[PDB]
């Protein structure tokens, strides 16, 4: 599990059948609410890549390399050949979509992937409704391998075609995209996949990645199959396809989530009892490799209470190894800044984007600590220092992926970020 690659696409161009075309495996769950135009889950696929004097980008199916993103026009390339397909790198594509409702999904599985690919839509209006919104949450978690995955010019008219992408790249000052060059794709016509799908893997090296450090895992899945009227021996833990960021996860590897449910007389944070967890079962995307390489995703099977893994209320819990370097205090500070627009809908008024509502007293707060949105009532918070008030004694490592949500309607907003000391 060496390198992850993340397609990142904002509102309204389509991210279902184009995930089917070039990545192979599409994302599906139960009571899923899977998409309306683009998806709302992590679109993940299982890949083993090989190149055999061939610029094409094949799948672990070892016969052809095409897709199904258009019904009429098929340009195609030299696919490869059979013969017990090989493995250049332990790579696997992942996706991070761009609505503002998936803050759990868009904030938990984005710092844990390795390479990023930002997409530009092709089914939206002449103003840019959400181009400067859905990698600005990825701004603070500081990914490096980022590219403009240029997507749609097919049904795009000529008046809004060849220059406005530069205006989108200039409009994304809150998005780290100036060091993101362009390797284009096509969501419909998928033209000439041997160079189009080539340097999204071939140009991208390993990221800066630590081999043998602590596995300080923020988990992305905790799912379970124990419906009313179930089997007898489903003793498991977090049944997960789990992307890891740091630390080698071998058999017998140690990893701890220290608070979980907060200890007795719940106003302290730690008691010296580590959480012993031996992860043996590890599914390397088509195989059972118990020795997990850092960075890439692997199918993680832990051993904890099975009752606690049915409904994943644990989006982004810190599971870290021995040597408990995370902090112990309940007075959370941040070094924040503000979102300059109040955008997510397009208009020409500049009226809802008037100001930035700061912290107050007798007034609520919520912010995705990693992907955990807690809060409470405040007492006296100053002007330019962010003092987040909470209720959960959690020995989290670094909340360097936070989004200050704020109510204006049925949906919350985006007003802030921040980096932990």
């Amino acid at each position: 599990a060496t390198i992850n690659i993340g397609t990142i696409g904002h509102v309204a161009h389509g991210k279902s059948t184009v995930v089917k075309a070039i990545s192979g495996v599409h994302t599906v769950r139960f009571k899923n609410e899977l998409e309306r135009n683009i998806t709302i889950k992590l679109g993940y696929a299982n890949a083993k890549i090989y190149k055999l004097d061939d610029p094409s980008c094949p799948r672990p199916e070892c016969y052809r390399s095409c897709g199904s993103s258009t019904p009429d026009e098929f340009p195609t390339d030299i696919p490869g050949t059979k013969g017990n397909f090989k493995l250049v790198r332990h790579v696997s594509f992942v996706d991070c979509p761009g609505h503002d409702i998936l803050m759990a999904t868009m904030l938990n599985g984005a710092a844990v992937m390795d390479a990023a690919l930002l997409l530009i839509a092709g089914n939206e209006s002449c103003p840019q409704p959400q181009t400067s919104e859905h990698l600005a949450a990825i701004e603070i978690m500081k990914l490096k391998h980022i590219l403009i995955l240029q997507n749609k010019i097919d049904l795009v008219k000529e008046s809004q075609a060849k220059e406005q992408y530069e205006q989108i790249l200039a409009f994304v000052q809150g998005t780290v995209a100036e060091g993101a060059p362009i390797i284009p794709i096509s969501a419909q016509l998928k033209y000439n996949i041997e160079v189009v799908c080539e340097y999204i893997v071939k140009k991208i090296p390993v990221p800066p990645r630590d081999f043998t450090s602590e596995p300080r895992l923020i988990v992305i899945r905790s799912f379970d199959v124990n419906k009313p009227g179930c089997e007898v021996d489903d003793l498991k833990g977090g049944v997960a396809g789990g992307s890891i960021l740091k630390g080698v996860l071998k058999v017998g590897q140690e990893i701890e989530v220290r608070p979980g449910i907060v200890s007795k007389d719940s106003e302290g944070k730690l008691m010296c009892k580590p959480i012993f967890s031996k992860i043996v079962s590890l599914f390397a995307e088509h195989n059972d490799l118990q020795y997990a390489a850092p960075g890439g995703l692997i199918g993680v099977g832990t051993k904890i209470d099975p009752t606690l893994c049915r409904a994943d209320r644990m989006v982004g819990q810190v599971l870290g190894a021995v040597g408990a370097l995370p902090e112990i205090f309940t007075e959370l500070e941040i070094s924040y800044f503000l979102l300059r627009r109040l955008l997510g809908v397009r208009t020409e008024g500049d009226k809802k984007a008037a100001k930035v509502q700061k912290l107050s007293k007798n007034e609520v707060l919520m912010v995705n600590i990693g992907s955990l949105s807690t809060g409470g009532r405040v007492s006296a918070v100053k002007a330019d220092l962010g003092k987040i008030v909470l209720t959960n004694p959690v020995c989290t490592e670094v909340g360097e992926k936070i989004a200050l949500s704020r109510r204006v309607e049925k949906h919350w907003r985006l007003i802030g970020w921040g980096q932990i000391r």
Binding site: K361, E363, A380, T391
Partner: protein, 329 residues
């Protein structure tokens, strides 16, 4: 048997303490007629101020950290067997409460509401049997009447501008419905499973015709009590106020539409207020006041002129010729 009730903690109360926090009279006119073996669910720091409550019955039940609304009933479930009354905290009380419970007895029903002293709610000609309530934004869709429910019931009267009190005269059928259908929540919003006309045990669904809720609810403070217990100095220009024992009673002040508590340093000169102050309020040296909700642990002297500026706790100010914009205090 009838012999139980409960009050939910949060709506849908730590800082707001008017004379007391939100529990003055609901326990009074809940317990001025019976109800001396009750079960109250609580949630922490507020669970340990239960000696100066001086109630002839207090049974508190805590919970977990960040919970919703139907889970309260689902965790008090294993010990309740009979007629149940569940309240909330968004309440003044200004009515003889025997009438709602006696009409709830009078149809042998399972439901009730309080809708008296944006907002739409319907009930028939007798004033007793309902359909559903309509709010300002969840009803972005316009309004839908079912066919048979209007085919049988001739008229309906939509009401315009009263307030909810979130009372529920209620019994075991719907709490069994809540424990078996656990994922169904939002007790304020679980009206839609009412089913007057479409069962795990003929039905009867039925109704009858407060605070502003973020935390404050202060503007309704001008309310008489059904003060008299104070060290009477009897020299102020006072009207429409209240105070408790062990309080400082000085001189040289006017008073109208104010409030005072116990152990508050009011001895030196002041003027009229139109402003409520809790316990532990220190005011001195000629203070004209306007529009202030002073909570506990307050101190000011030597030229304080409050003009439309409510307060909080930990008041640290002495001199401010105030403009009418409210601020943090």
């Amino acid at each position: 048997m009838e012999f139980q009730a409960v009050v939910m903690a949060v709506g849908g109360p730590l800082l707001p303490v008017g004379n007391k926090p939100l529990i003055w009279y609901p326990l009074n006119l809940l317990e001025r007629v019976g109800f001396e073996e009750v079960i109250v669910v609580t949630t922490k720091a507020l669970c340990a101020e239960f000696k100066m409550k001086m109630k002839p019955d207090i049974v508190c039940i805590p919970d977990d950290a960040d919970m919703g609304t139907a889970d309260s009933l689902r965790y008090i479930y294993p010990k309740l067997k009979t007629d149940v009354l569940v309240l909330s905290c968004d309440l003044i009380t200004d009515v003889a409460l025997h009438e709602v419970v006696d009409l709830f007895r009078a149809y042998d029903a399972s439901l009730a509401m309080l809708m008296r002293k944006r907002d739409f709610i319907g009930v028939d000609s007798t004033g007793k049997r309902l359909l559903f309530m309509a709010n300002e934004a969840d009803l972005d869709e316009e309004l839908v009447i079912k066919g048979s429910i209007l085919q049988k019931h001739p008229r309906i009267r939509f009401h315009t501008g009263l307030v909810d009190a979130h009372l529920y005269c209620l019994k075991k059928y719907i709490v069994d419905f809540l424990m078996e259908n656990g994922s169904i929540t939002s007790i304020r919003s679980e009206l839609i499973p009412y089913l007057v006309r479409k069962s795990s045990q003929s039905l009867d669904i039925y109704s009858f015709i407060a605070p502003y809720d973020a935390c404050w609810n202060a503007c309704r403070g001008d309310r008489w009590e059904d003060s008299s217990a104070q060290i009477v100095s009897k020299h102020l220009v006072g009207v429409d106020s209240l105070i408790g024992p062990e309080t400082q009673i000085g001189e040289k002040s006017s008073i109208k539409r104010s409030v005072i508590g116990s152990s508050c340093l009011i001895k030196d000169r002041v003027t009229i207020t139109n402003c409520l102050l809790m316990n532990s309020v220190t005011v001195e040296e000629g203070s004209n006041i306007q529009g202030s909700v002073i909570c506990n642990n307050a101190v000011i002297e030597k030229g304080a002129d409050i003009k439309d500026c409510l307060i909080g706790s930990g008041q640290r100010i002495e001199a401010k010729a105030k403009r009418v914009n409210e601020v943090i205090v």
